[PDB]
Amino acid sequence: RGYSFSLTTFSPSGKLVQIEYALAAVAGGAPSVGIKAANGVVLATEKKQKSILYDERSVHKVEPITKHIGLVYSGMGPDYRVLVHRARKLAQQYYLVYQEPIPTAQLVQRVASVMQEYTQSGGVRPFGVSLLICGWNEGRPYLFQSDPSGAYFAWKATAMGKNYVNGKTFLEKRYNEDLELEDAIHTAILTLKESFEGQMTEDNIEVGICNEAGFRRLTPTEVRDYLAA
Amino acid sequence: SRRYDSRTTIFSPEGRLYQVEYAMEAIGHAGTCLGILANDGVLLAAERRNIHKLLDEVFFSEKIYKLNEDMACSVAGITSDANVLTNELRLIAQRYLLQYQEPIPCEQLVTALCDIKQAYTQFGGKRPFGVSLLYIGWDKHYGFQLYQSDPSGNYGGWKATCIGNNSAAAVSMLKQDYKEGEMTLKSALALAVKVLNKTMDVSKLSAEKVEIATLTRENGKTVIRVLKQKEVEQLIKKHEEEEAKAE
Amino acid sequence: TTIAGVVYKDGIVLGADTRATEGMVVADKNCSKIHFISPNIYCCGAGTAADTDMTTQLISSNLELHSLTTGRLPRVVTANRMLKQMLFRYQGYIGAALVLGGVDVTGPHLYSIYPHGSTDKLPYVTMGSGSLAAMAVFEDKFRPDMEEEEAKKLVSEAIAAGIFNDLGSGSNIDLCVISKSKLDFLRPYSVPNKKGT
Amino acid sequence: SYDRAITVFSPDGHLFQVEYAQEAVKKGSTAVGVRGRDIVVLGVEKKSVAKLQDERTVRKICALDDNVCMAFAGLTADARIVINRARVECQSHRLTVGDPVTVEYITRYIASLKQRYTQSNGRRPFGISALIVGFDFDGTPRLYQTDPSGTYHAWKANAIGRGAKSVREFLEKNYTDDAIETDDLTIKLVIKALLEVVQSGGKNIELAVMRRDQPLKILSPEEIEKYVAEIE
Amino acid sequence: RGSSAGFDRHITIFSPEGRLYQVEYAFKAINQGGLTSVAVRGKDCAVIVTQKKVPDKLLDSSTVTHLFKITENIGCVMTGMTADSRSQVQRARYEAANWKYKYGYEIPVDMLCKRIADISQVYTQNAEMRPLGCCMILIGIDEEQGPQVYKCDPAGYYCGFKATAAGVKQTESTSFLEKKVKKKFDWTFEQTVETAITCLSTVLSIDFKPSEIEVGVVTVENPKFRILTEAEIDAHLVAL
Amino acid sequence: MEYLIGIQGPDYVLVASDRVAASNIVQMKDDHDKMFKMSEKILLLCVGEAGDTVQFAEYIQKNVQLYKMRNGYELSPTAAANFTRRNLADCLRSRTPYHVNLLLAGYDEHEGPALYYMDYLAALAKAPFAAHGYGAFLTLSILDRYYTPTISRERAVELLRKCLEELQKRFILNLPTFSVRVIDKDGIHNLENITFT
Amino acid sequence: DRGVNTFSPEGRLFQVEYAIEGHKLGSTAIGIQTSEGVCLAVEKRITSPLMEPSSIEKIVEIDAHIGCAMSGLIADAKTLIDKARVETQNHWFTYNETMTVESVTQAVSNLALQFGEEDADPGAMSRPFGVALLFGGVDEKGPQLFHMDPSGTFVQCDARAIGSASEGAQSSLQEVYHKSTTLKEAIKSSLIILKQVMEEKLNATNIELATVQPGQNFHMFTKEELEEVIKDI
Amino acid sequence: SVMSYNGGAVMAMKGKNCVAIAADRRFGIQAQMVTTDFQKIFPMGDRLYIGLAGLATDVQTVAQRLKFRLNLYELKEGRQIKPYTLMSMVANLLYEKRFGPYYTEPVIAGLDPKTFKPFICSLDLIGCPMVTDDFVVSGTCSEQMYGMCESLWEPNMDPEHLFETISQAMLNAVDRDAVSGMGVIVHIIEKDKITTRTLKARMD
């Protein structure tokens, strides 16, 4: 009926190697990038299909949670789907009780609590995925990041997946605090371009934005114009 | 199945508890935190561990967590477990207030939490929380207090303690500069700054590698106020001046 | 209370009055009875107002979830099924009566839902305490495949007849027009009563 | 639910978990208790006081009821659980039978709990040993002692912890109906019985006395200090 | 390459690389049966073809089928372990009936696929059970989009395709189909049966008789899932 | 009916009660105790249905004693009153509700005296004087007429005697004896009984 | 390695085989059945002269006509003693008569082997008990003496000895006993063998002795009568 | 009736950037007064009060559970609650006991924490929220204060005239109710001030 003992334990040096190994799994996903601007945030991913047979339209990596929140991932997709489903349920319960849209910080706290529960229960492994949350509430844009352990942060510009070290090393230089959302998109795209090993196309990447009006992922017809420059 | 069990809650051939011994060594490498008690209030002073430029300081603090109208704490170890513990402490305080219509005392709060920490070491098969806490507060009976818990589940009242990294040398130098009964809040701040300045391997403090909170009673009300960067900078300047003057 | 809906050529028109009472005394003079369920589905309510509020909020949350999970517009048949299954599960103890209506990929629909959980699809319907007064007007003047302006005129006249002949209704007329493209909300549509100067 | 046999038999009929629990209780700070004519006294050793604690919060001598008190050795976190359960039991007994408990009643309750944690699934044994003293309605003082296994006896005087191996030999030879005549005689007896195991010198000791009146009185540091001078 | 530490190769816990070896073994279990499937979708049709190799001639071959019906307009083909695939088909049928009962209309192919995929993700996480060693392919007509072709796997990954191929010869059977999506929309007309049979035969060299395959069909003209007769299969085979 | 009274002064909280334990037309007892001491400075008085009183009062007392034994100090009168209200209200809608009418008197080292009223619906008040029973109607207006905020204990016993005498003259029940005690700084002090032999 | 329930290449149940070895480390007891009653006797095995000897109770009373003497894990024996008391009181309550030594031994033996670690009960045992018992009493057929093991096998004896010196105690009991004893010669010989096998000196405070006979109830020997008997011997 | 067993009367009125709430003090049982200092108005926030009427035990219980939940909310989020959010939370609390409900009818009055825009609302026993723009009432003299407010109310009133109107309404309303009276307390929630007053009423 299920195991009752933990699978994550302490080591003679105080480490949790199951969590370290879930992080090593995350370090082998596809690159992700987030950049917070003066009036919005931007999420940009590498959606590179294995071969031409795969129908690109069917599966997406940038998903909404409410009318003002959306997130991307790096790591394992089947785990990402479970997390997305539970986040949607969490937001609906909050709205049911308070008749108000949930704030991004409360959303991130509840999601990280679930991810932490999966480090100390019986007979389970930790999730192999880190998240990048986006939001806008009370006239301010937010951008958080959640780890496989259950620890969340807050950034101005970050990068996940493969080549994240060089990603943030390059991201630090250009970043300005006065940056507009439309000029931030160029930097997000350029950062992805540094490590792509190929040729950019309207179906190689996904891009989502969030401003005053809500969350939405750009359409390939718009990604085309943005890639033209 | 028995093959995969790891037996987190058993004795060792010498009477030890290995999982707790290992969680203590986990807590050994965290960021330095220190507390000091005085005549007119208590103070906490932690160390900022994440100093990356691209971060955001949206929160009013990083390791403070006001638990009630009269108390507050600080953690060392694993943030993910710290969040669970802080939620539990808030719930305990509100249940007490609902039953008696008075605020809870600090020793009762610390006790009710250490019971939960202890029940994770005797049965269940789980692993224990890798977190140490410090508390500060004020109540009707004993006034300003300062406690400390550990993963095993035993606490104790103090007057000037320290957990985290290099806490051994921190307490060693605390023993020689603390004088019972005569310390005021300002001399407390001075000693705290001058202890943090040494027990951190960096050349000198930065007023953003630190984080300082106090607690006082004013007009029959408790005030818990996190100090500001300018105030901290002024304190550091004062420390720099007097130390330089002596030699 | 008086609620009434109609099916015209290219959509739905709903309506209600705006007076809440408590026994024999007017409590509120602007009580809103047309609720949001989805960007294309709306609902009216009569009976125990707390039950109406609770049920419509729960159904709206469930439909938002379902739409997020599929990726397409929701359906009046799905909303109707959810509602009737809940109301039958509670054996009539939740005293709400509903006039669900919308427009989906199949076209305009209009249902009636009762406290015990029985439903009925129709081209026009009324509910409340002036329901007989509105039904007389509907029987006398309804024509199939009507146009928008005349549908609005007919439903406003039915609501007014219910307002002027029922002691438990009055004070204003709301209208909500749903078509395949627009979603028009008219809260102070008509003001037949003015307080004495 | 966790249902595993943690403590099981071994070749030659040993219970290794209980033996390890006892090897753990053999590392605490020494405690000593004797039974007087009209008084009972206990005494615990403090390894180090650290010049910075608040001793009001690290006391190893509690009060389970008006006439019963105890003192332990082993693990403080386990001792606390046992003590609170004993308090709730005392209140239940008072409620149901309208009379304060006997010392043997509460000793039996504690020993039953300790034994139950040696035969249940998914538990480890407690790692503490207790010394229970008090008076009864007759006016007869008692002194008992429990074990991590659930066995308890009644003793004239005893010592638990480290160094008890020599405290017992000292107390055996020196215990006599002469050192028992008066309270300031028995208290000096206890003090010199504790001092040869305290190798720090001076007073690093806590000492509580309990008489038929003014229950659980605890000697002040200054008062305990006076007795040390008298002995020398 | 990837080191090991502890119980990595016995339960679903992370390796020092984060690899989950116990899930890489169900993929090898897929290649145990020794069959191969191929699904192709066209401008108005979806088609399934399946090898039919009976061991010797005492079996009633009217019962040895890899094609299944989930609802009236959804069909499926399994590959891998037989009893596993039977349990998965039962689960899919129950999911499809419950959807209709709850929401009043018929479940879409992608929704059914996602349900099966999250049911399998749970076997990838808890340690007391094992992953099912079978693959799945689905087809159907969507009233809004048209023809659809989806595929799950034992890891919980459920992408959508233009033309799939699962089984023992997966790599080369997809390398063949790679060359033919260049132009003419891979012969987007009711005769993609030609393409499917040709792709199945090219890397197997069998030139099958009129009864060593099974084919299934959905169309926009008739939406229900039909299994073509031997004569119909023979005519296509004869033309080849 | 049983009788209860309490009078709070500058630093005392003088209370009283009766001693009869009737069952039917007969009288079973003549010196019954309707006061439950729970702490060195807290008294609890009870009336109502048999079984309920003692079952309810002993539970409160054991919990107060356990609190003291755990924490090293005693509950305050306010905390005890609120704990009592909670425990009484949580039983109101349960399967077995009590039917007790209470009166909590106390004295604390900061706020001074305190007198709490509590009916069987678990509504808690605070008053300078109160009373339970049928005799409350007859003795509430003598206290109204003669009470003073700065009254001394010598006069307070005078006023209580006047109330009991009025009861003796005008009640239809036979209540001959009454207990009387005071809670000042020095704990509880039993006083002389008042008999009307 | 193994579970608690695990046969061996000889079908032996390892855990029971160990709980049985846990008895050769206890203090010897002795029972003897006569035509005039039964007698039980057990060594107390004092450790140091500071321990009160009136605090070692190894011979308890189950009812007004049954007594018990144990050896092994005195902490474990107490649940068995309690359950035997409760069963006897239930039998009295229901049938208005006294139970029988056979029925009590049989009901107590049914708790043994009732252990396990999966689908057992809400709170169940995790190992076998480590106590051997000796029941004595009188009923509608006369004095009887039974014996119980951790495996759950109970027999009926007339002179049994359990403990760490039994392989030497029975070698004398088989020569001493005969079907024509009286309880007095029984008591004498039961004392002589104890003295024979013990390590200390058999005096009047490091032993225990009780008797049941058809006339009286369960009665324990006093430090007056016991001393007189010892001196008389 | 059960909600007429302890009496009570609550009232809230809206002005120009100011709210006002009022209640009576009498606490009694069916036909007999016990005390005259019963509290029926609770400070849920800096400028956010709630007034409860009905059964006094349920008044106390609901106030205490609400304070529980609001403390937890303001500790978890990090800011103060809004008047609209508080109303929804109270409605949820009351609807959780739809069968076997509390006998209490609440009233909310506050100021918007950033726009300083007033807010009044009342809920029924089961949790039905109705928001108005002039005034709300609740208690045993509801009809009397309806008759008073409809006649005396004006739009865009100052705090002075608001106080005069709410006091003059409560006085004459409770002067015609048997189980209400013993004095009236009035809170005036302005932007930077909260003024409290006690009126002189009749004691019969």
Separation in Å, CA H127 to CA A214, C92, F93: 32, 19, 20
Euclidean distance between CA atoms C109 and C107, whole angstroms: 6
E and G interact (at least 3 Cβ pairs within 8 A):
no
Closest partner CB to H89 (pick from A98, A103, A106): A98
Token look-up 């427009």 returns C103
**CB-based contact B62:H28 (threshold 8 Å):** no
Run of H or E residues at H177: none
Dihedral of CA E162/E165/E170/E175: which sign?
negative
- Tell me the nearest-neighbour CA distance from E84 into chain C, angstroms: 28
**Residues H173 and H148: beta-carbon distance below 8 Å:** yes
8-state DSSP, A155: B
- Helix H or strand E segment including F31: none
Does domain A1-229 bear CATH number 3.60.20.10? yes
How many domains in chain D?
Answer: 1
Residues with Cβ within 8 Å of A53's Cβ and at least 6 positions away in sequence, in order, are: E161, E162, E163, E164, E174, E177, E178, E181
Residue of chain D minimizing CA distance to A5: D2
In order, the DSSP letters of A43-57 are EEEE---SSTTB-GG
Number of neighbouring beta carbons within 10 Å of residue H101: 15
Integer angstrom CA distances of residue F98 from B99, F20, F132: 19, 21, 16
Q: Which of D17, D23, D51 sits opposite B175 (nearest CB)?
A: D51
Q: Which two three-digit tokens encode residue G226?
A: 């016991």
CA D91 to each of CA D78, D87, F46, F59, F111: distance values in angstroms, whole numbers, following the listed order: 21, 6, 22, 10, 30
> In A15-38, which positions are buried (b, 16+ CB within 10 angstroms) versus exposed (e)?
ebbbbbbbbbbbbebbbbbbbbbe
Rounded distance between C-alpha atoms, residue G211 and residue G214, angstroms? 10
* F117: closest chain H residue by CA: H34
CB contact under 8 A, B100 and F71: no
Classify residue E68 as exposed, middle or buried by CB count within 10 Å of its CB (0-12, 13-18, 19+). buried
CB contact under 8 A, C50 and H124: yes
* N-to-C CA span, chain F: 20
Contact criterion met (CB < 8 Å) for E108 and C70: yes
Q: Do chains F and C touch (3 or more CB pairs under 8 A)?
A: no
Across D10-43, b (16+ Cβ under 10 Å) vs e yields: eeebebebbbbbbbbbbebbbbbbbbbeebbbbb
How far, CA to CA in Å, does B108 sit from each of B96, B105, F70?
10, 5, 10
Residue pair D9/G127 in contact (Cβ under 8 Å)? The answer is: yes
**Could you tell me which chain F residue has the CA closest to the CA of H2?**
F121
Largest Cα–Cα distance in chain G?
59
Contacts 24+ apart (CB under 8 A), A139-146: A141/A36, A141/A37, A141/A39, A141/A40, A141/A41, A141/A210, A141/A211, A142/A36, A142/A41, A142/A104, A142/A105, A142/B58, A143/A34, A143/A36, A143/A41, A143/B56, A144/A104, A144/A105, A144/A108, A145/A34, A146/A108, A146/A111, A146/A112, A146/A115
E29 CB neighbour count, 10 Å cutoff: 17
Count: domains in chain E: 1
Q: Which chain E residue lies closest to A26 (C-alpha atoms)?
A: E18
Pairing of strands G66-69, D157-160: unpaired
Could you tell me how many residues make up chain C?
197
Structure tokens at C41: 């589905």
Instruction: Name every chain E residue with its beta carbon within 8 A of the beta carbon of B1.
Output: 128
Single out the residue of A11, A117, D49 nearest to residue B24, CA to CA: A11
Quote the CA–CA distance of B136 and B146 in Å, as a whole number. 5
Contact list in A for residue D3 (CB cut-off 8 A) is 4
Q: Are F191 and F181 in contact (CB under 8 A)?
A: yes
Q: What is the 3-state secondary structure (H, E, C) of chain G?
A: CCCCCCCCCCCCCHHHHHHHHCCCCCCCEEEEECCCCEEEEEECCCCCCCECHHHCCCEEEEECCEEEECEECCCCHHHHHHHHHHHHHHHHHHHCCCCCHHHHHHHHHCCCCCECCCCCCCCCECCCCCEEEEEEEEECCEEEEEEECCCCCEEEECEEEECCCHHHHHHHHHHHCCCCCCHHHHHHHHHHHHHHHCCCCCCCCCEEEEEECCCCCCEECCCCHHHHHHHHC
Q: Cβ contacts (< 8 Å) between F70 and chain D: which residues?
A: 84, 87
> Would you say H181 and H201 are in contact if contact means Cβ atoms under 8 Å apart?
yes
Burial class (CB in 10 A: 0-12, 13-18, 19+), B105: buried
Q: Which residues of C touch H132 (CB under 8 A)?
A: 28, 30
Contact map slice: A 87-106 vs H, CB within 8 A: 97-100, 103, 106
A221: left (phi over 0), alpha (psi -120 to 50) or beta: alpha
Q: B124 near D2, Cβ under 8 Å?
A: yes
> Residue E140: beta bridge partners?
E74, E148
Q: Counting beta carbons within 10 angstroms of the beta carbon of residue B119, is it exposed (0 to 12), middle (13 to 18) or buried (19 or more)?
A: middle
Residues of D in contact with G23 (CB under 8 A): 13
Altogether, the residues listed in chain G come to a count of 233
Of E127, E174, E181, the CB nearest to A7: E127
Contact status of H128 with chain C (Cβ, < 8 Å):
yes
F28–H contact, CB cutoff 8 A: no
Counted domains in chain C: 1
Query: Considering only CB atoms, which chain G residues are within 8 Å of D150?
Result: 75
Alpha carbon C29 to chain centroid distance? 18
Is residue E156 within 8 angstroms of chain A, CB to CB?
yes
To the nearest whole Å, the CA of G148 is away from the closest chain D CA by: 18
Q: A104-117 vs B79-100: helix axis angle to the nearest 10?
A: 110
| Whole-number Å distance between alpha carbons of C41 and C183 | 10
Chains that touch H (3 or more CB pairs under 8 A): A, B, C, F
C-alpha A137: how far from its chain's center? 18
Q: What is the resolution of this structure in A?
A: 2.7
Distance of CA E115 to the CA centre of its chain: 16
Question: What does the alpha-carbon distance between residue F66 and residue D95 come to, in Å, rounded to a whole number?
Answer: 11
Enclosing domain of residue D20: 1-232
Distance CA F146, CA F156 (A): 10
Whether chain D lies against chain H with 3 or more Cβ pairs closer than 8 A is no
Copy the structure tokens of residue F73. Answer: 């100090």
* Amino acid (1-letter code) at residue E51: Q
E163–A78 C-beta distance less than 8 A: no
Owning domain of residue C89: 1-197
Which chains contact A through at least 3 pairs of Cβ atoms less than 8 Å apart? B, C, D, E, H
Least Cα separation, residue A11 to chain B (angstroms): 6
C-alpha to C-alpha distance for B138 and B69, rounded to whole angstroms: 10
Q: Please indicate if any CB of chain F lies within 8 Å of the CB of H103.
A: no
Of D63, D84, D94, the CB nearest to F62: D94
Contact between chains at H100 and F85 (C-beta distance less than 8 A): no
Residue H95 at interface with chain C, using a CB cutoff of 8 Å: yes
Name the minimum distance, in Å, from the CA of C141 to any CA of chain H: 35
Where do runs of H (alpha helix) occur along chain F?
52-71, 77-89, 136-146, 153-170
Are the C-beta atoms of residues E2 and E17 closer than 8 Å to each other? Answer: yes
Report whether H142 contacts H53 (CB < 8 A). Answer: no
Sign of the alpha-carbon torsion through G140, G144, G150, G153: negative
Encoding tokens for residue G212? Answer: 């049941």
Catalytic residue numbers of C, as ranges: 1
Type and span of the H or E element at F108: strand F100-108
Distances (CA, A) of G27 to D98, D215, G15, G60: 40, 40, 22, 16
What end-to-end distance do the CA atoms of chain A give, in Å?
58
User: CB distance C80–E103 less than 8 Å?
Assistant: no
Strand order in the sheet with A63-64: A63-64, A70-74, A130-136, A141-146, A152-154
Chain F residues inside the 8 Å CB shell of D95: 58, 62
Are D25 and D148 spatial neighbours (Cβ–Cβ below 8 Å)? yes
Name which of D10, D19, D20, D25 to mutate to probe chain B: the one with the most chain B Cβ atoms within 10 A of its Cβ. Answer: D20
Cβ within 8 Å of residue E177, ≥6 positions away:
A53, E38, E40, E163, E165, E186, E199
Residue in chain C closest to A86 (alpha carbons) equals C65
Mutate to test the interface with B, among F75, F82, F110 (most CBs of B within 10 A): F82
Which residue's entry shows tokens 């000196």?
Answer: G201
Are H88 and A103 a contacting pair at CB < 8 A? Answer: no
Helices (H) and strands (E) in chain E, counts: 6, 9
Residue B238 buriedness (CB in 10 A; 0-12 / 13-18 / 19+): middle
User: Per CATH, is G1-233 categorized as 3.40.50.261?
Assistant: no
Other CB atoms within 10 Å distance of the CB of residue E235: 13
Q: Give the bridge partners for D63, in sequence order.
A: D69
Between chain F and chain H, the number of residue pairs with CB atoms below 8 A apart is 29
In DSSP terms, H104 is beta-bridged to H54
Chain D CA closest to residue F59? D95
Residues of chain B positioned with their CB less than 8 A from the CB of E11: 4
Cα G113 from Cα G128, distance rounded (Å): 6
- Break chain H down into helix, strand, coil percent, rounded to 5: 30, 30, 40
- Name every chain D residue with its beta carbon within 8 A of the beta carbon of A5: 2
Q: Which residues of C touch E104 (CB under 8 A)?
A: 75, 77-78, 80-81
Identify which of H76, H77, H88 has the shortest CB distance to residue A99: H88
Chain-chain contact of B102 with F78 (C-beta, under 8 angstroms):
yes
Check: CB of residue F115 under 8 Å from CB of residue F125.
Answer: no
Burial bucket for residue G118 (CB in 10 Å: 0-12, 13-18, 19+): exposed
Judged by CB atoms closer than 8 Å, whether chains meet at C58 and A95 is answered as no
Q: Are D131 and D33 in contact (CB under 8 A)?
A: yes
Please report, for chain H, the start and end positions of each structural domain, with discontinuous segments joined by +.
1-204
Q: Phi/psi class of residue G78: alpha, beta or left (left: φ > 0; alpha: ψ in -120 to 50)?
A: alpha
Tokens (6 digits) for G32: 């003897």
Nearest-CA distance B19 → chain E (Å): 18
**E40 to B157, E44, E65: CA distances (angstroms):** 74, 11, 19
Residues of F with Cβ-Cβ distance to D87 under 8 angstroms: 66, 69-70
Q: Which residues of H71-88 are buried (b: 16+ CB within 10 A; e: fewer)?
A: bebebeeeebbbbbbbbb
Q: E strand or H helix at A78, and its extent? A: helix A77-98
**Do residues G44 and G207 touch, judged by C-beta distance below 8 A?**
yes
Query: Going by C-beta distance under 8 Å and a sequence separation of 6 or more, which residues neighbour residue E42?
Result: E147, E186, E187, E188, E189, E190, E192
Q: Give φ, ψ of F125 to 5 degrees.
A: -120, 175
Residue C57: strand, helix, or coil: helix
Domains and CATH numbers, chain B: 18-246 (3.60.20.10)
CB neighbourhood size of B234 (10 A):
13
Q: Which residues, in sequence order, are bridge partners of residue G156?
A: G146
Structural domains present in chain F: 1-197 (3.60.20.10)
Retrieve residue B141's tokens: 């009976």
Q: How far apart are CA A136 and CA A154, in angstroms?
A: 14
Put simply, the answer to whether D88 touches F62 (Cβ < 8 Å) is: no
CATH superfamily of H1-204: Aminohydrolase, N-terminal nucleophile (Ntn) domain (3.60.20.10)
List, in order, residues 6 or more apart from G76 with CB less than 8 Å away.
D115, D119, G129, G130, G131
Give which of H172, H166, H156, H130 is closest to H41, Cα–Cα. H166
- In degrees, rounded to 5, the angle at the alpha carbon of residue H118 between the alpha carbons of residues H114 and H120 is 130
CA D146 – CA D74 distance, rounded (Å): 12
The pair of three-digit structure tokens given for residue A176, joined into one six-digit string? 């300005």
Q: What domain range includes position E14?
A: 1-240
Burial of H188 (C-beta count, 10 Å sphere; 0-12/13-18/19+): buried
Cβ–Cβ under 8 Å, residues B158 and D57: no
Which 3-state string (H, E, C) describes chain B?
CCCCCCCCCCCCCCCCCHHHHHHHHHHHCCCCEEEEEECCEEEEEEECCCCCCCECCCCCCCCCCCCCCCCEEEEEECHHHHHHHHHHHHHHHHHHHHHHCCCCCHHHHHHHHHHHHHHCCCECCCCCCCEEEEEEECCCCCCCEEEEECCCCCCCCECEEEECCCHHHHHHHHHCCCCCCCCCHHHHHHHHHHHHHHHCCCCCCCCCCEEEEEEEEECCEEEEEECCHHHHHHHHHHHHHHHHHHC
